[PDB]
Amino acid sequence: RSPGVVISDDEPGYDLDLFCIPNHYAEDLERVFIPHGLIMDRTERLARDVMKEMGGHHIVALCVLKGGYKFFADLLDYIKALNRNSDRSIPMTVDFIRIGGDDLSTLTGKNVLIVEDIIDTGKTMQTLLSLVRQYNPKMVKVASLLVKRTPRSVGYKPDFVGFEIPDKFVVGYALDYNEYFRDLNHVCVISETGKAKYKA
Amino acid sequence: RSPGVVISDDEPGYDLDLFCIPNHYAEDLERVFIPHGLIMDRTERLARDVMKEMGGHHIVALCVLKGGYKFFADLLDYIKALNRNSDRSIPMTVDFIRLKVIGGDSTLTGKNVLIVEDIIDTGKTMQTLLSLVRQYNPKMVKVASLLVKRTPRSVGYKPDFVGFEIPDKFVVGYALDYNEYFRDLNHVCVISETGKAKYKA
Amino acid sequence: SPGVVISDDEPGYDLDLFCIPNHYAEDLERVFIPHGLIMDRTERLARDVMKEMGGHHIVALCVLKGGYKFFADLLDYIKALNRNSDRSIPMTVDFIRLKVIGGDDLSTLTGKNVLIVEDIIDTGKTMQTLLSLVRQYNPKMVKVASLLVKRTPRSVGYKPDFVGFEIPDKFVVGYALDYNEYFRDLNHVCVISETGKAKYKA
Amino acid sequence: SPGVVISDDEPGYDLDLFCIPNHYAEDLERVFIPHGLIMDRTERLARDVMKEMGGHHIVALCVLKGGYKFFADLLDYIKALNRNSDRSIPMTVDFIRLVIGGLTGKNVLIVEDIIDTGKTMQTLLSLVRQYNPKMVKVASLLVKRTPRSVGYKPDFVGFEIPDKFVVGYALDYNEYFRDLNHVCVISETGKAKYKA
Ligand SMILES: NCCCN(CCn1cnc2c(=O)[nH]c(N)nc21)CCP(=O)(O)O
Ligand SMILES: NCCCN(CCn1cnc2c(=O)[nH]c(N)nc21)CCP(=O)(O)O
Ligand SMILES: NCCCN(CCn1cnc2c(=O)[nH]c(N)nc21)CCP(=O)(O)O
Ligand SMILES: NCCCN(CCn1cnc2c(=O)[nH]c(N)nc21)CCP(=O)(O)O
Ligand SMILES: [Mg+2]
Ligand SMILES: [Mg+2]
Ligand SMILES: [Mg+2]
Ligand SMILES: [Mg+2]
């Protein structure tokens, strides 16, 4: 339904000085695009949407490592918060994929929620949705923190979107650039003095 | 030095549907203006700034009720987080004051005083308060305000710590109110036309 | 529900097991109630309150100074419920201390669901007075939420409607509870060391 | 520091004193370790880690699945220290499932939910020693007192618990009770319903 929080092309983002930033990343980042707390507030709402739509059956929460781990944890924490303060409640099991994970035979007949960090071309998720559906789940839904407006898009749209962003390489909140920037709490844009430095 | 997070005049804010909003305010709000989480992030840095400038002597944190209570609580929580996770720290003491003055209290003498306010608009409230505080000779007076409005009506006061500098729009939430309502709202938001009419006094 | 009961011989926790402000390092003896334990109890307390007072407009009344942390945290959890359910109720806030100095005219309490938030009940005198006073303005309901309740011989016998913890007859500090204005800037509820009790004596 | 010690006669907490998920209302006996208590212990655990390993680049290795919640929180506190200190030391994240999932010349922080016999941690240690790093330390949320123990004692311990079977906070019982804030003790009805 919703395209998520839409971030425009001309969005300047925030100065790093305005926030508390992991200072081993001072000169490598351009601006802060999505502050940690903004992600949290958005994730809280997403959690309520997920429960409204899939909270009528047992849910299997599928975390796509590594970039999705932070989103996955916070999303589940907000779901768990709903489940212990409402009369409506569904049990959840958790799984982790990259390669690994449990036998996807456990997905049969269950409500599967795939949790991803970002959709670019959409190829990764199409491949994943292809492989999951061959085990006939009761329901497959996909929640992605980010969706990128890009000419290379297939045209796939996930079921839950946190943020729709421009075609710029974002890092932070578990999103990496060659395994760097994962320990950053905010989603920020990597600079050239950060790209060339951490390249390859 | 820092004017805080500058919110542009053409800032659209956020559609309500994207966030979790209290049901009884569903039709009373127009947009989410400053999301609760953004306030926390900015406040976290603000706590570090305060500790850099005032972390030398015993401080008295003065809360300007009612609107400042949320910001007061969170800012103190962030400062306390620093105090218990760092080598050197500074002991704090808390006082409360409401202005027409209804609160107390002369205890500010010789102490580092941190006044915590929700929003500076014309500057009169703070000017008055600062005169009343300087009446009793504190070692230092500092003001942290969550919001500072850009308005021609401004006398020209600028606090030492600012979270967000905003346009001349009437905001509510995060303890800020409209005729005592909307204090029970985490986000800073803009009132709808129906909302203004419903809670009009 | 008397809340979480703490026995008279509860040793508490060694300070070395938790993160405490170093400027209180030699001023405290044991951690009595960890801050996180307080939050969890407070989460359940918020649900109970809405279950009982969610019917009509709520006026939350904070008893300064000691109750500000509990008040802010209790109301945060209540707000979390209000924006995640289909049914929510408006809530206005007020601040008093500790006669009633400061605060709005108590006539505004007329007809509303009044919820009084206090840090600690000892003799019960402070609360019984305030209750009798508030009842004069004929509100639909008056309920008292208190973080702590002491088991003391001096007790008149008042029992609040919502209790976080029932504690022994020791003097505790932290979570906005003070010893001569000190220790309010402490996250955990703790007991004072004799060295600290002597340092901040009045 | 042997961590927080929970005695054998620990009655735990009555479920009615806390907020608990509906679907586990009868599957639980007592709340054993409140979520908030876990956070407070973890916060102090983070400063212990930074005291010991915070001079060099750390690689935090998460042990799936049970350790994921403790791993996330412990990292958040370390990251919080890291962006409030003056000497911000970088850290990378790795994941391993025990061997389904899965450094040389780096500092490794292994993060685990619970030490029981030590068989899991023993294997992982010998499986990490092969890659030859600089330093390896182990952080475990729980260390269970048991006669079936090899006698391994990790470098960082949150809580020392009696020989009871606890669930919650990503610790499971046949993959259930992971969606639970507090560490709790299973009810006998719960053992029967979710048996495999
Ligand atoms: N082969 C891939 C790893 C992940 N890809 C995402 C890589 N990626 C694509 N864009 C970004 C980005 O802005 N930041 C980060 N950290 N990663 C990015 C999949 C995106 P899709 O095009 O298959 O839908
Ligand atoms: N006499 C009163 C205190 C409140 N005023 C703030 C009133 N105020 C001024 N602007 C706003 C607003 O946008 N929202 C809310 N809730 N209140 C607002 C003080 C601002 P200043 O003009 O003395 O510097
Ligand atoms: N508003 C006033 C006085 C404070 N009293 C509480 C003082 N007090 C009573 N016990 C304690 C304690 O253990 N710690 C702290 N900080 N304060 C304590 C009120 C309790 P009561 O009138 O119902 O007997
Ligand atoms: N990798 C997995 C699990 C095996 N053990 C965990 C099994 N285990 C041992 N005790 C418990 C318990 O109390 N709760 C839960 N959920 N699991 C428990 C690890 C401890 P060890 O016996 O290898 O030294
Ligand atoms: Mg991915
Ligand atoms: Mg004001
Ligand atoms: Mg009191
Ligand atoms: Mg394990």
- Are the beta carbons of C56 and A20 closer than 8 angstroms? no
CA nearest neighbour of A21 among B53, D84, C170: D84
Where would I find the H helices in chain B? 36-54, 69-83, 124-134, 193-198
| Pocket of ligand 4 contains residue D148 by CB under 6 Å | no
Provide the token pair at A173. 């909140």
Nearest alpha carbon, ligand 3 atom 19: C126
Which tokens belong to D38? 């876990």
CB contact under 8 Å between A18 and B5, yes or no, is yes
CA closest to D5 among chain C residues: C13
Check chain B for breaks (C–N over 2.5 Å) and list the residue before each, or none: 100, 105
Residue A102, classified by CB atoms within 10 Å of its CB into exposed (0-12), middle (13-18) or buried (19+), is middle
SS3 A32: strand
The resolution of the experimental structure, rounded to one decimal in Å, is 2.5
Q: Residue C97 forms beta bridges with which residues? A: C101
Backbone φ/ψ region at C140: left (φ over 0), alpha (ψ -120 to 50), beta? alpha
Using a CB cutoff of 8 Å and minimum separation of 24, what contacts does B78-83 make? B78/B43, B78/B44, B78/B46, B78/B47, B79/B47, B79/B50, B79/B51, B79/C185, B80/C21, B80/C185, B80/C186, B80/C187, B81/B47, B81/D80, B82/B47, B82/B48, B82/B51, B82/D84, B83/C21, B83/C22, B83/C23, B83/C185
Binding-site positions of D for GMP read 65, 112-120, 144, 164-166, 172
CA-based nearest residue to A161, from A3, A35, A49, A41: A3
Longest dimension (CA), chain B: 53
Q: How large is the angle between the packed helices B36-54 and B69-83, nearest 10 degrees?
A: 60
Which among D57, D109, D69, D78 is positioned nearest to A179, based on CA atoms?
Answer: D57
Task: Indicate the residue type of B138.
Answer: P
Taking every pair of Cα atoms in chain C, the longest distance, rounded to a whole number of angstroms, is: 53
Report residue C91 as tokens. 């809530």
Provide CB contacts within 8 A for C57, sequence distance 6+: C89, C90, C91, C92, C112, C113
Contact C117/C67 with Cβ under 8 angstroms?
A: yes
Among all chains, which residue has been given the structure tokens 């998720």? A125
Assess whether the C-beta atom of B188 lies below 6 angstroms from ligand 2. no
Q: Are D110 and D49 in contact (CB under 8 A)?
A: no
**Alpha-carbon Rg for chain A in angstroms:** 17
CB contact under 8 A, B81 and D81: no
Residue A19: what residue type?
F
What residue type is assigned to position B131 of the chain? S
Where are the alpha helices (H) located in chain C, listed in sequence order? 35-53, 68-82, 125-135, 194-199
Q: Which of B104, B108, B112, B41 is nearest to B78 (CA)?
A: B41
Q: Which residues pair with A13 in a beta bridge?
A: none
Please indicate whether residue A170, judged by its CB atom, sits closer than 6 Å to ligand 1. Answer: yes
Strand partners, D111: D62, D139
Sequence-distant (6+) residues with CB within 8 A of A48 are A78, A82, B20, C84
- Please name the residues in contact with A77: beta carbons below 8 A apart, sequence gap of 6 or more: none
From CA B22, how far away is CA C84, in angstroms rounded? 7
Plot region of A190 (φ>0 → left; ψ -120 to 50 → alpha; else → beta): beta
> What one-character DSSP code corresponds to residue D187?
P
**Which residues is C179 bridged to in the sheet?**
C182
CB of C91 within 8 A of CB of C57?
A: yes
For chain B, the straight-line distance linking the first and the last C-alpha, in angstroms and rounded, comes to 39
Query: Is CATH 3.30.70.560 the right assignment for the domain spanning C1-202?
Result: no
- Dmax (CA) for chain D in angstroms is 53
Annotate D27-41 with three-state secondary structure.
Answer: CEEEEEECHHHHHHH
Q: Which amino acid is at B161?
A: F
Q: Are C146 and C42 in contact (CB under 8 A)?
A: no
3-state secondary structure of D55: coil
Picking from D119, D187, C176, A34, the residue whose alpha carbon sits closest to that of residue B77 is C176
Q: What share of chain A is helix, strand, coil (3-state, %, to 5)?
A: 30, 30, 40
Q: Between β-strands B59-65 and B112-120, what pairing exists: parallel, antiparallel or unpaired?
A: parallel
Sign of CA dihedral B190, B196, B199, B201: positive
Residue B51: C-alpha distances to residues B38, B69, B74, C97 (Å): 20, 20, 14, 29
Of the candidates B176, B173, B178, B177, the residue with the CA atom closest to the CA atom of residue B188: B173
Cβ contact A60:A95 at 8 Å: yes
The closest of C113, C2, C87, D167 to A86, measured between CA atoms, is C87
Spatial contact of C133 and C105, defined as CB atoms under 8 Å apart? no
CB D65 within 8 A of CB D172: yes
Q: Provide CB contacts within 8 A for A150, sequence distance 6+.
A: A120, A121, A167
Distance (Å, rounded) from C-alpha A196 to C-alpha B8? Answer: 33
- Rounded-to-integer distance, Cα D55 and Cα D47, Å: 12
Q: How many CB atoms lie within 10 A of CB B57?
A: 12
**Residues in Cβ contact with C54 at an 8 Å cutoff, skipping those fewer than 6 apart:** C87, C89
Ion ligand 6: residues, CB within 5 A, are B 64, 67, 117
Q: What are phi and psi of C63, to 5 degrees?
A: -90, 100
The closest CB to that of C47, out of A44, A48, A85, belongs to A85
- Ligand closest to Cα of C63 equals 7
One-character DSSP codes across A68-124: THHHHHHHHHHHHHHHTSSS----EEEEEE---SS-GGGGTTSEEEEEEEEESSSHH
Q: Strands B29-34 and B188-191, how do they pair? A: antiparallel
What does the block give as tokens for D54? 């915070």
* Single-letter residue type at A53: E
Rounded CA separation D196/D179 (Å): 18
Burial class (CB in 10 A: 0-12, 13-18, 19+), C197: middle
Is the C-beta atom of B189 inside 6 A of ligand 2? no
Tell me how many residue pairs between chain B and chain D have CB atoms under 8 A apart.
9
C81 contacts in chain A (CB < 8 Å): 85
How far lies B56's CA from each of B51, B103, C112, in Å? 8, 28, 46
What are the structure tokens assigned to C144, written together? 């008292």
Cβ–Cβ under 8 Å, residues D159 and D4: yes
Task: Write down the residue that tokens 């760092």 correspond to.
Answer: B86
Catalytic residue chosen out of the listed positions D116, D155, D163, D179: D116
SS3 labels along chain C: CCCEECCCCCCCECHHHCCCCHHHCCCEEEEEECHHHHHHHHHHHHHHHHHHHCCCCEEEEEECCCCHHHHHHHHHHHHHHHCCCCCCCCEEEEEEECCCECCCCHHHHCCCEEEEEEEEECCCHHHHHHHHHHHCCCCCEEEEEEEEEECCCCCCCCCCCEEEEEECCCCEEECCECECCECCCCCCEEEECHHHHHHCCC
Tell me the three state secondary structure of residue D89. Answer: coil
Give helix then strand counts, H and E, for chain A: 4, 9
B154 touches B124 (CB < 8 A): no
Is residue C182 within 8 Å of residue B91, measured between CB atoms? Answer: yes
User: Nearest to residue D20, comparing CAs of D33, D31, D7, D4?
Assistant: D31
Whether B117 and B174 have beta carbons less than 8 Å apart is answered as no
How many angstroms separate the CA of residue A3 from the nearest CA in chain B? Answer: 10
State whether B35 and A37 contact (CB < 8 Å). yes
* Parallel, antiparallel or unpaired: strands C58-63 and C28-33: unpaired
Reduced to 3 states, what is the DSSP secondary structure of residue B172? Answer: strand
Structural contact between residues D112 and D141, judged by C-beta atoms closer than 8 angstroms: yes
Q: Return the structure tokens found at B198.
A: 């419903």
Distance of alpha carbon D172 from alpha carbon C192, whole angstroms: 39
E strands in D9-70: 28-33, 58-64
**What number of residues does chain B have?**
201
Nearest to C116 by CA among C62, C57, C73, C67: C62
B49 is a catalytic site residue: no
**Which pair of tokens denotes residue D12?**
């735990």
How far apart, in whole angstroms, are the C-alpha atoms of residue A113 and residue A58?
A: 10
- Check residue C8 and report its DSSP letter: T
* Cis before C65 (ω within 30): yes
Residue A120 in contact with ligand 1 by CB distance below 6 A: yes
Rounded Cα distance between C189 and C54, Å, is 29
The one-character DSSP state at A174 is T
Taking residue C140's Cβ as centre, other Cβ atoms within 10 Å add up to: 14
Report which secondary-structure segment, H or E, holds D110.
strand D107-115
Q: Is residue C105 exposed (0-12), middle (13-18) or buried (19+ Cβ within 10 Å)?
A: exposed
Lateral strand order in the sheet of B140-149: B5-6, B161-166, B140-149, B112-120, B59-65, B92-98
Q: What is the 8-class DSSP label of residue D158?
A: E
Residue A115 backbone phi and psi in degrees, to 5: -115, 110
Would you state the structure tokens that stand for residue B88, as one six-digit string? 């050197």
Atom of ligand 3 at shortest range from CA of C150: 10
Count the neighbouring beta carbons within 10 Å of the beta carbon of residue A167. Answer: 12
Phi and psi at A119, nearest 5°, equal -105, 115
D101: CB partners within 8 A, 6+ apart:
A96, A98, A99, A100, D64, D95
- What tokens appear for A154 in the block? 């297939």
Residue A17, judged by CB atoms within 10 A of its CB (0-12, 13-18, 19+), counts as: exposed
Domain D1-196 has CATH 3.40.50.2020: yes
CATH top-level class for A1-200? alpha beta
Helix axes C68-82, B69-83, angle to 10 degrees: 110
Q: Distance between CA atoms of A37 and A162, rounded to whole angstroms?
A: 13
Rounded distance, CA A162 to CA D144, Å?
Answer: 40
Contact A97, A112 (CB under 8 A): no
Question: For D128, how many CA atoms within 13 A lie in the half-sphere containing its CB?
Answer: 28
Q: Tokens 């008893």 sit at which residue?
A: C63
Name the nearest CA neighbour of C92 among C68, C108, C69.
Answer: C108
Provide the 3-class DSSP secondary structure of residue A169: coil
Residue position matching structure tokens 């400027």 = C23
| C-alpha dihedral (D81, D84, D87, D92), degrees to nearest 10 | 50
Q: Are C48 and C81 in contact (CB under 8 A)?
A: no
In whole angstroms, give the CA distance from residue D190 to residue D175: 13
Closest residue to A37, CB basis, from B14, B36, B48? B36
Beta bridge partners of B140: B112
What H or E segment, with its residue span, contains residue D135? strand D135-144
CA-to-CA dists, residue A93 to A90, B2, B75, D20, D174, angstroms: 10, 47, 37, 17, 10
Please report which helix (H) or strand (E) contains residue A36, including its range: helix A36-54
Burial class (CB in 10 A: 0-12, 13-18, 19+), B159: buried
Subunits in contact with chain A (3 or more CB pairs closer than 8 Å): B, C, D
Residues 6+ apart with CB under 8 A from B131: none
* SS3 at position B49: helix
Q: Give the C-alpha separation, A39 to A74, whole Å.
A: 9
Q: Which two tokens stand for residue D173?
A: 């019982």
Q: Which single residue is written with the structure tokens 């990503």? A: D170
Spatial distance between the Cα atoms of B151 and C21, rounded to a whole number of angstroms: 41
The rounded Å distance from CA C49 to ligand 7 centre is 19
Rounded Cα–Cα distance for residues B24 and B32 (Å): 15
Q: Assess contact for A104 and A135: CB atoms under 8 A.
A: yes
How far is B177 from B171, CA to CA, in rounded Å?
A: 8
Nearest protein CA to atom 4 of ligand 3, as residue: C126
Which conformational region is residue C36 in: left (phi greater than 0), alpha (psi within -120 to 50 degrees), or beta? alpha
Whether residue C168 contacts residue C149, with contact meaning beta carbons closer than 8 Å, is answered with: no
Give dist(CA D191, CA D196) in Å, integer: 10
Token digits of residue B4 = 């805080």
Among B182, B150, B147, which residue's Cα sits nearest to residue B30? B182
Within 10-49 of C, beta carbons closer than 8 Å to B belong to 19-24
- φ/ψ of residue B6, rounded to 5: -85, 115
Question: B1-201: what fold?
Answer: Rossmann fold (3.40.50)
DSSP B101-154: --------TTSEEEEEEEEESSSHHHHHHHHHHHTT--SEEEEEEEEEE--TT-
